[PDB]
């Protein structure tokens, strides 16, 4: 629902990177791996979750009980 703070393999902290990643993709559109590669992701299992994990919370906050 929100990027797991650690991966399922390394468990290196992912959390900081998602925002910084996503921004780094939107601002200054750049190659994915290279982004991560110069964002500091090396291990591919670490990497998959930034290349993956569609965020469902932002598509949820469309729906909320309170509005």
């Amino acid at each position: 629902m929100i990027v797991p703070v650690r991966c399922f393999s390394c468990g290196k902290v992912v959390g900081d990177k998602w925002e910084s990643y996503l921004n780094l993709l939107q601002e200054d559109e750049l190659d994915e791996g290279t982004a991560l590669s110069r964002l500091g992701l090396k291990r591919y299992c670490c990497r998959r979750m930034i290349l993956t994990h569609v965020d469902l919370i932002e598509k949820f906050l469309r729906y909320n009980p309170l509005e």
């Binding site: 399922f8 393999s9 468990g11 591919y44 979750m49 290349l51």
Partner: protein
């Protein structure tokens, strides 16, 4: 930017599915229903007056839904998702304009509401129709739910599209013994009717029609059919020379030995054996006794007035049984799709509705009749409100029908049941997955061999992957991803148009015409068989592909059976594909830049003559290409892409062409059983059962299919790294095994939601069922068992609830069901309180509850309970490639390898699955996975497509992993090099239903069922397990005496019968009853099922008197 002639095609299919939706089938036919059909339906019966009241009539005029002439769409109506919680039917009022007669010079009309219509989501009249993402939001229901399913009484279900055998067509079944029955069954409105014809004995060939009695000689028939020649009869059905002459002519011989011509006797002998006229209106008993219905019984397809038409229809029909009786083969086998037709929900609601409405108004005669009985004053006040008291029985009866699934139609004299299923949300794929489904029925016994397997003709116009293990009494089949089910167009314009091509009529035919060309058949009905087969097909197709009669109404030939068939029957399977125009495609590859530009759209290719929808029969005539790369100037078409051949679920398998198909089958049956996000509405909907996954992820491999349905926005599964290896011998067969400090890190976790509603209704004593609660003894706390709340007296958010506690406290009056009297004084309490208790192994949570009202104004409480399940030992994990396996013994961390960067696999899986299950597709998928991350991309794969393998090699080696997709690892325990390179990397997995914690079931001593006095049924209620006979007798091969007794007796039904040596019978306590002594009794133990069986017998007159004898003294 010019485009590949190959790769350009790929933008067609989306635009095809863009405008015209994936599920249109229901959608259109429902819209097409509510729009067109009813205006025809009432146009059938708009007029009623009982026999009375010399000047009256009631004339229906308009039917509308939502438009009473305030707004266009309904001014306001309940929101569907909101109704899902109110647990109502979700419906729309029926606006009906009717002009009646009441009193002197009136003839007056209005709009009326006869009832409400249980509409279908995302229809035209649906609120959701063309509503942009805020109306989704503000209306609180998902964008990505395809809709196309009804909702009633708080549930939803679907109308399952049911395939029915092709109707109104001559079909010959060739069966040994017998004599090869011909049958044609046809229906128009009234009288859906079967008809048969066949030999009985040795060339002597008769009509079996349940209308008539039985066994009517066909030559006599065709005589009565108006052709009297007896020469062109033979010449007609036969041919020119060959041997066919006498082969048929035997009947003609012993035909003659009875009677001749057609004054009376031809028609008469028919009517001679016809059944009764049902008393009155028998006056048609004549020399023309049946002559009216002689033509029309089961031959309504033509009827009309003179006899030549259907006369020759029967003739050509007879041609197939003589060409049959010539030889086996040379016949038709009820198999290949075109001879069968699925038929959409649109007409289901049509028939069921209009027949309920039918019998309704039929009884509305009576509805005014009671008023009409005594001429009180002058009788008028035309029953305008009086429809209401009669009304909504349509709506109600329509509701209970549409949810229940039992359809009794006694005007059609036919009854289908199990027409619907409870809508399946176990997962996202299932959503459209339970749609796009097809039911087969009838087809003689279930053992009958022919209507069973998957035949090749099925190519690309259904799914060929999915046929789940639920085969059973019938069969389900799934569509393609490019499908068009055809709507019935029209008859006469295309007929007289056929005449415009210069065809001829049976009236102008020589009655020597088994030589001329082939034949023309409209609906499968012969007309002229115009000369010059080919150019005919050319001209008309050219009409179709250019200016007219779009969709189907296509055409195909047959050389052997001599015909060219061109009928306009809907409910017919269709599909696009690219015409090759002479040498090559009509596309011409530049026109697609004129497509991708954004201004082309679709349906143009029809009107600009590029591509069109076709038929299995049509393509049986055509010759199709595969790649524009490989074509022949003699070709006809190419279908844009192969991978629409896969089914809606099958589109998930990466590179399926590298598998063996059964693993694709199982893979479909598992996919819909995966667990995932469902829909954006997720936490705002409450369903009787739900699953989801904490951290779903786009599968590293995609299939461009997924890109269509945005399945990447709704993944079910994890993208999980694995190392193929036999490590941790706990693995063995198919049994996967996992990683702690990963499961600890949040791998594969599932919130499991359920709901338990409790209806609150008032009882005739006029005392509500009450929620009272909050005891709080002990000075400040409610007892643990009762400590599951707060002052409200009902469950609340955010509480661990251990089984034995109260997640709703429901107090009902113990006198509630009593008979109230015109009195009360003080206490209307007398409550026997039955709060329901959460039962189960492990705590759940109440995070959400709803107090709300149904339609009848009564208190209704609905709560949802949830618990997250850490993926404990023994959980089904699909590898999404067909590997269906239990989670094995969970490793800690260190154990299982790590290697260079230290990346530790998560799932760790046995190699042995891959050799015998023989599926290399996954084995490629892993390569593609380790690739994509390393280049930083998702990875396409699709049937005969996607990223190929070789490119990945360089893709991998540059970044330093062996192109073979393998690497060293290091011992999870020992810490040395592993003695063989391991293939490992990313693979997308998924978690399933059949979580063990649900499934594990045990009892010590559980309840017994009153009737048989023994353990109850299956899981849930409580336990007991099944020793079947076939299961039992296995113990006898070991010959264990006592194991039977302890098992089938001492632990089964523990009972002692008391009997009487003299006249052995079973008494009770100390009596032998019928012989009343209270002495000779012997007490002994017996299975209570035994004594049961006895009394059951001795209930019926019978006496298995039990005589006894000692165990001891030898």
């Amino acid at each position: 930017d010019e485009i590949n002639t190959a790769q350009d095609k790929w933008h067609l299919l989306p635009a095809f599915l863009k405008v015209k939706g994936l599920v249109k089938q229901h959608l259109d036919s429902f819209n097409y229903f509510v729009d067109t059909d009813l205006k025809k339906i009432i146009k059938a019966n708009q007029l009623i007056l009982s026999d009375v009241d010399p000047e009256f009539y009631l004339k229906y005029v308009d039917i509308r839904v939502g438009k009473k002439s305030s707004s266009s769409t309904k001014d306001y109506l309940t929101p569907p998702h909101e109704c899902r919680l109110r647990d109502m039917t979700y419906s729309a009022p029926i606006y009906v304009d009717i002009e009646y007669t009441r009193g002197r010079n009136i003839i007056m009309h209005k709009d009326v509401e006869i009832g409400r219509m249980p509409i279908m989501l995302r229809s035209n009249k649906c609120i959701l129709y063309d509503a942009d993402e805020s109306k989704m939001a503000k209306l609180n229901e998902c964008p990505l739910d395809p809709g196309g399913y009804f909702i009633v009484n708080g549930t939803e279900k679907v109308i399952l599209v049911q395939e029915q055998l092709s109707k109104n067509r001559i079909i010959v079944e060739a069966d040994e013994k017998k004599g090869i029955v011909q049958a044609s069954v046809t229906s128009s409105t009234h009288e859906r009717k079967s008809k048969t014809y066949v030999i009985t004995k040795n060339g002597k060939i008769y009509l079996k029609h349940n209308s008539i009695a039985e066994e009517i000689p066909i030559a006599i028939v065709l005589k009565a059919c108006g052709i009297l020649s007896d020469l062109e009869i033979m010449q007609l059905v036969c041919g020119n020379d060959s041997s066919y002459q006498d082969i048929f002519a035997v009947n003609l011989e012993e035909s003659s030995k009875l009677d001749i011509y057609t004054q009376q006797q031809a028609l008469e002998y028919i009517g001679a054996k016809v059944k009764t006229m049902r008393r009155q209106k028998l006056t048609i008993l004549q020399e023309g006794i049946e002559a009216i219905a002689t033509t029309v019984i089961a031959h309504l397809t033509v009827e009309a007035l003179d006899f030549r038409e259907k006369a020759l229809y029967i003739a050509m029909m007879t041609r197939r049984v003589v060409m049959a009786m010539y030889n086996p083969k040379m016949i038709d086998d009820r198999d290949y799709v075109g001879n069968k037709r699925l038929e959409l929900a649109g007409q289901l609601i049509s028939l069921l509705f209009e027949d309920l409405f039918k019998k309704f108004n039929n009884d509305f005669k009576l509805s005014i009749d009671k008023v009409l009985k005594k001429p009180n004053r002058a009788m008028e006040y035309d029953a305008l409100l009086s429809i209401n008291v009669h009304s909504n029985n349509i709506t109600s009866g329509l509701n209970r029908a549409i949810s229940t699934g039992n359809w009794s139609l006694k005007r059609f004299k036919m009854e289908r049941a199990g027409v619907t299923h409870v809508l399946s949300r176990l997962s996202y794929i299932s959503a459209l997955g339970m749609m796009t489904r097809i039911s087969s029925q009838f087809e003689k016994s279930r053992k009958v061999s022919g209507p069973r397997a998957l035949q090749p003709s099925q190519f690309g116009m259904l799914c060929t992957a999915d046929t789940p293990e639920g085969e059973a009494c019938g069969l389900v089949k799934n569509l393609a991803l490019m499908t068009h089910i055809t709507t019935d167009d029209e008859e006469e314009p295309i007929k007289k148009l056929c005449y415009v091509l210069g065809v001829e009529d049976i009236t102008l035919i020589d009655s020597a015409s088994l030589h001329l060309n082939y034949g023309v058949y409209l609906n499968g009905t012969l007309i002229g068989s115009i000369r010059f087969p080919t150019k005919f097909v050319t001209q008309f197709r050219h009409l179709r592909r250019t200016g007219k009669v779009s969709e189907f109404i296509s055409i195909y030939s047959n050389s052997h059976q001599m015909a060219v068939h061109i009928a306009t029957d809907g409910g017919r399977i269709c599909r696009p594909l690219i015409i090759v125009s002479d040498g090559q495609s009509r596309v011409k590859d530049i026109h697609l830049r004129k497509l991708l530009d954004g201004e082309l759209d679709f349906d143009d290719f029809l009107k600009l003559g590029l591509v069109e929808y076709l038929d299995v029969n049509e393509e049986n005539d055509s010759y199709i290409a595969l790649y524009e790369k490989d074509i022949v100037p003699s070709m006809t078409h190419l279908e844009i892409e192969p991978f629409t051949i896969l089914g809606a679920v099958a589109g998930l398998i990466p590179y399926p062409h590298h598998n063996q198909s059964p693993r694709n089958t199982y893979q479909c049956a598992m996919g819909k059983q995966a667990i995932g996000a469902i829909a954006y509405n997720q936490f705002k909907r409450i369903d009787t059962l739900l699953y989801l996954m904490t951290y779903p992820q786009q599968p590293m491999v995609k299939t461009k299919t997924i890109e269509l349905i945005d399945y990447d926005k709704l993944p079910a599964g994890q993208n999980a790294t694995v190392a193929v290896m036999s490590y941790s011998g706990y693995d063995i067969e198919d049994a996967l095994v996992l990683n702690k400090s990963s499961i600890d890190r949040g791998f594969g976790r599932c919130e499991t939601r359920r709901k338990t509603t409790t209806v609150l209704k008032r009882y005739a004593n006029h005392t509500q069922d009450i929620i009272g609660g909050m005891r709080v003894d002990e000075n400040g706390d409610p007892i643990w068992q009762h400590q599951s709340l707060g002052p409200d007296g009902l469950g609340e958010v955010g509480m661990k609830v251990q089984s034995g506690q109260i997640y709703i406290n429901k107090s009902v009056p113990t006198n509630s069901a009593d008979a109230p009297n015109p009195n009360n004084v003080n206490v209307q309490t007398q409550y026997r309180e039955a709060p329901v208790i959460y039962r189960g192994p492990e705590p759940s949570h109440i995070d959400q509850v709803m107090m709300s009202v149904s339609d009848n104004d009564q208190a209704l409480i609905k709560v949802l309970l949830r618990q997250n399940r850490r993926p404990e030992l023994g959980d089904k994990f699909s590898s999404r490639h067909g590997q269906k396996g239990v989670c094995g013994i969970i490793v800690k961390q260190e154990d299982m390898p790590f290697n260079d960067q230290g990346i530790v696999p998560d799932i760790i899986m046995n190699p042995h699955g891959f050799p015998s299950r023989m599926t290399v597709g996954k084995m490629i998928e892993l390569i593609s996975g380790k690739a994509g991350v390393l280049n930083g991309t998702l990875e396409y794969g699709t049937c005969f497509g996607g990223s190929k393998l070789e490119d990945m090699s360089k893709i991998l080696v540059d970044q330093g992993f062996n192109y073979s997709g393998k690497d060293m690892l290091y011992s999870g325990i020992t810490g040395e090099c592993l003695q063989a390179y391991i293939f490992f990397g990313p693979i997308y997995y998924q978690k399933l239903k059949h979580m063990v914690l649900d499934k594990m079931h045990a009892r010590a001593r559980g309840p017994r069922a009153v009737l048989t006095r023994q353990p109850t049924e299956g899981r849930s209620r409580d336990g007991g397990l099944r020793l079947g006979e076939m299961e039992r007798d296995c113990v006898i091969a070991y010959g264990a005496s006592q194991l039977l007794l302890e098992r089938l007796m001492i632990s089964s039904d523990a009972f002692e019968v008391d009997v009487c040596d003299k006249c052995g019978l079973m008494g009770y306590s100390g009596w032998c009853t019928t012989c009343k002594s209270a002495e000779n009794i012997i007490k002994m133990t017996i299975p209570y099922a035994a004594k049961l069986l006895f009394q059951e017998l001795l209930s019926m007159n019978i006496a298995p008197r039990l005589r006894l004898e000692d165990i001891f003294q030898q």
